[PDB]
């Protein structure tokens, strides 16, 4: 420092951070980007639980995103912005745990409400540095600080060899826990209020949110919770400790490391990264969509027991949350090798290969299980119409892994003593590149969370600014408050709690909040109270 | 003497009578025997045919009521005693009744044939709603009907057996339609355009004349209302038919070198009827509803197989058939034995109450069936609402036994070559004696198609007696040419056809013709295609 910014420098437990001044459309907000929070998990350190980072001397510049965790690098539609646009923007590495923060420039003088995201990425990918996460706009907007986490993904972030030490499984998540710590004890410097802390995350980062609220150790790090298209409940977000050691095991075996766990795991831990990722698909036990190879592991420690388990017999009397999903949560999982479907065409399949898809769909699913998916989902009207097909096949998928288990949380959170919130977010982006038939997909409610659209250069439109400013507004008021409502406001449609009783939720779209009964009732019962006793007794 | 009221039959000479209806007179020739008596050893055989007379037979009242179980559920009720025998009870009870106009018709008359339900065991020609004047004036009909043995009498089997073949009741019915092919011209009926029409139990008969060969030169076309051959009650196998016969006996004191099935017939021939019909309800499996313990029996002989295999085999391609039901099917079923109704209040339901209610109504249904059917069936948004509980156990029972056996029947005639229509009546007869929330029950359609809202006396609305006068046009035109519809009056809207396809049918009611497509589709997509999937697999 001698002719430095002094809203820039701010000093952490691990010493000096120098931030920058960015521009967002309504004025300045300050970014702290880069920051580390743990040891670089690499070397003997790959597999296991992160250690707290080492302080530092001198001024850390925090001027730039850092690495992005090792992953998969979607290449599906090579150039299409609809895929690259959740492709990683820095470079690969073992060495990417660092967090983000956005503050209002200046800092505000009493302590201001933290939003701390997670992004998603089926446990596999993902970074805290793609566009659609800027902090940037809320920090401006709102007034508040945000903050985002990069967490190791793929095999090194949850492979698990149970029961072993160098190897247990859930680390993942145990960065994600580390970086709450981290702001626990920092976020004050940046003029954030430790005392309200609210996650937020879609998909996999929704999964995780819900596994803090499930995992004791969290649950004095934040108080608030909203859950975007994802639970910790259901088919994909976790795994036995039984098959996460299958699929270790098997992936060892792939990569030249034949199976004695320390022997294992250290012969894992000599592979190249590359090579892990080159193999990390390879380990599914069936031809199926909406499944990942690596994710949290039931354990007997993160999680103490299955997140059904857990959500049947908590106490949630203390907590407060926000829940819910998109119009069309399938659609894009469809273009991920279910034959018959593709982005360049309206995918209007056959009867034949809507049962393909279901078989696919439902990959746990018997012979009879199947038929019953296939019949639910029929319109006996027009059995072979190759649209409502295309779009049954879609549904499928949606509810299976989204829609039912969003309900199933909603449900026992409620009963359980929790305020709960829930919405369907109906707004097809007007910028989209992903053709008409897919709806909104899963994933594109979160530009507008973050309020891209008044980012006047990226041509939203005018009333998409507006609708942007809404839900801005209605999740930083469920930070501040535990409610989304305005205090102020007056008829503006009020938001509802979600009750067992009468199951309401609110539609978020270009017009004022619609009130609605039921979030998908009957073909809820059918996933979340029939399909399983298909497995249980027969 | 009237020479309009004396006609020379086969057999002899006959006096009928002449009869009031509010337009105009109508000759009536009720009970001429068509069969000996089928008393002492000619108990459970096939009906002979009546000898000749000598002078003049009386035929100016109904005869006797074939022996029967008489209903003393409500007594002095009229819901329930209007279904009761109107004459003395007999095992002589071969005669059938025919109303022309009058004068006798000029040129050769379309004619109906009636044949009642009363679910196997019950029933008369004689009852009030079956009455056949008001068609026969009107709309200038030739209709008949016959009475024909129930119960044990007419539906004990010892299958393989001489002394008790079984369906002894269908060939009674046969031989009254052989006895109109020679005798009705006489009459001025045509023989060569005779069309059968029935409900419930009587429309399952129909639907076996259509499904065995020597029945189908003896009619043109068909018409069943509310029953159906196949379906869960009409049929039972030679086996289970053998068994009830065999524990009837048992219970009977029969059997106290031959042997043991002419030995049995023989002892249960020495019994007085009214000892047969003592114990015909302690022969059933389970406690169930709408079942009953002596129906047509698949022989091999009448049926050749299966009604389900039959309809799914048989080439139906100079066939026309009316098909339909009521709106509340299942209600008037209830309060005979289903804990929880009752006439006399609004019959409110628990769950509990419910689920114990499936399994009586299912009778077949295994523990995950059973609940398959409740899941189904709830309404989840209220799923604890009395309410519909209530309204819900009466469509599960009017969708198993009759909605959805309709459904199948409608779809594989259509598929075959028939050509179909389908009606569903939701008029409550105003007259009505069974509470509202029976809606309209199974039965009362057959009053307005038989035109009593005719007679002023009986105190029928305007609207219903111009209602009623729609539906002896559907019938009558569908006598007529095989097409409800009215040949020359344009303007309509048109009751299309059934097919498979477009699945059109028409709701019958005070307001016009509605075309609606889906017979009920999703739920009995359920109980035709999933439901069998359960019961033969686990
Ligand atoms: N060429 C093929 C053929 C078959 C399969 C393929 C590739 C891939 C694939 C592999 C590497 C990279 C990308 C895809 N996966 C792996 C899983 C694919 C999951 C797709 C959606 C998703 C879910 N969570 N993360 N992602 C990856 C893409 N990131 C997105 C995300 C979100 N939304 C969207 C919406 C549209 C497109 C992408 C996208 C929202 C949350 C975060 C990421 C499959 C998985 C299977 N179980 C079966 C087939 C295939
Ligand atoms: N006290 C108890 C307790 C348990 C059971 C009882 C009686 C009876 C019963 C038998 C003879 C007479 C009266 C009752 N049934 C026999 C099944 C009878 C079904 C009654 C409804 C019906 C339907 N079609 N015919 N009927 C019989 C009487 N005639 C009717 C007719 C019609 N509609 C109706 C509508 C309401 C009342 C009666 C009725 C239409 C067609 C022809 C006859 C049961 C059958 C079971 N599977 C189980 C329990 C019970
Ligand atoms: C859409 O394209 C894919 C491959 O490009 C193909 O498999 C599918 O059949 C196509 N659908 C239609 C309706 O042409
Ligand atoms: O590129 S957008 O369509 O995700
Ligand atoms: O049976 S009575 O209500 O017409």
Redesign the interface.
């Given at each position: 420092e001698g002719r430095e910014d002094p809203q820039l420098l701010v000093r952490v437990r691990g010493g000096q951070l120098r931030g920058i001044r960015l521009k967002a459309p309504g004025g300045p907000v300050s970014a702290f980007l880069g920051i580390p929070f743990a040891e670089p998990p690499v070397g003997s350190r790959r597999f296991m639980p992160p250690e707290p980072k080492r302080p530092w001397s001198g001024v850390l510049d925090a001027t730039t995103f850092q690495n992005v965790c090792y992953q998969y690098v979607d290449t599906l539609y090579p150039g299409f912005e609809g895929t690259e646009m959740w492709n990683p923007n820095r470079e690969l590495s073992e060495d990417c745990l660092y967090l983000n923060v956005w503050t209002p420039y200046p800092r505000p003088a009493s302590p201001t409400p933290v939003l701390i995201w997670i992004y998603g990425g089926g446990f596999y990918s993902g970074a805290a540095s793609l566009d659609v996460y800027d902090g940037r706009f809320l920090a401006q907007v709102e007034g508040a600080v945000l903050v985002s986490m990069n967490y190791r993904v793929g095999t090194f972030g949850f492979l698990a060899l149970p029961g072993s030490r160098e190897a247990p499984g859930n680390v993942g998540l145990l960065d994600q826990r580390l970086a709450l710590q981290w702001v626990q004890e920092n976020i004050a410097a940046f003029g954030g209020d430790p005392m309200s802390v609210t996650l937020f995350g879609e998909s996999a980062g929704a999964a995780s949110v819900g596994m803090h609220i499930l995992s004791l150790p969290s649950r004095s790090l934040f108080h608030r919770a909203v859950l975007q298209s994802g639970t910790p409940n259901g088919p994909w977000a976790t795994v036995s400790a039984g098959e996460a050691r299958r699929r270790a095991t098997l992936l060892a075996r792939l990569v030249g490391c034949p199976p004695n766990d320390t022997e294992l795991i250290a012969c894992l831990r000599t592979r190249p990264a590359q090579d892990l990722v080159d193999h990390e698909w390879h380990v599914l036990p069936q031809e199926s969509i909406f499944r990942f190879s690596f994710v949290p592991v039931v354990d007997g420690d993160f999680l103490s027991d299955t997140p059904e388990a857990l959500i049947n017999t908590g106490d949630f009397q203390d907590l407060q949350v926000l829940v819910g999903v998109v119009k069309d949560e399938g659609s894009a999982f469809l273009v991920y090798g279910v034959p018959g479907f593709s982005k360049d065409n309206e995918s209007l399949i056959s009867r034949a290969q809507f049962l393909a898809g279901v078989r696919i769909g439902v990959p746990q699913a018997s012979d009879?299980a199947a038929?019953?998916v296939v019949?639910h989902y029929?319109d006996?009207?027009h059995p072979e119409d190759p649209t409502h097909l295309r779009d049954a096949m879609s549904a499928v998928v949606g509810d299976h892994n989204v829609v039912c288990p969003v309900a199933q949380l909603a449900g026992r959170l409620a009963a359980q003593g929790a305020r709960v919130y829930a919405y369907i977010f109906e707004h097809r982006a007007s910028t989209l590149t992903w053709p008409l038939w897919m709806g909104v997909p899963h994933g594109y409610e979160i530009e507008f969370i973050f309020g891209l659209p008044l980012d006047p250069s990226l041509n939203y439109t005018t009333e998409e600014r507006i609708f942007a400013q809404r839900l801005m507004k209605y999740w930083t008021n469920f930070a501040r408050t535990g409610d989304p409502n305005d205090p102020r406001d007056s008829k503006s449609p009020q938001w509802p709690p979600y009750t067992t009783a009468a199951?309401q939720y609110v539609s978020l779209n270009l017009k004022p909040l619609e009130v609605r009964?039921?979030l998908r009732?009957?073909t809820?019962?059918?996933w979340n109270?029939?399909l399983p006793?298909?497995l249980s007794?027969?």
């Open positions: 009879l038929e019953a019949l029929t006996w009207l199951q009964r039921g009732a009957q809820c019962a059918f109270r029939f006793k298909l007794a027969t």
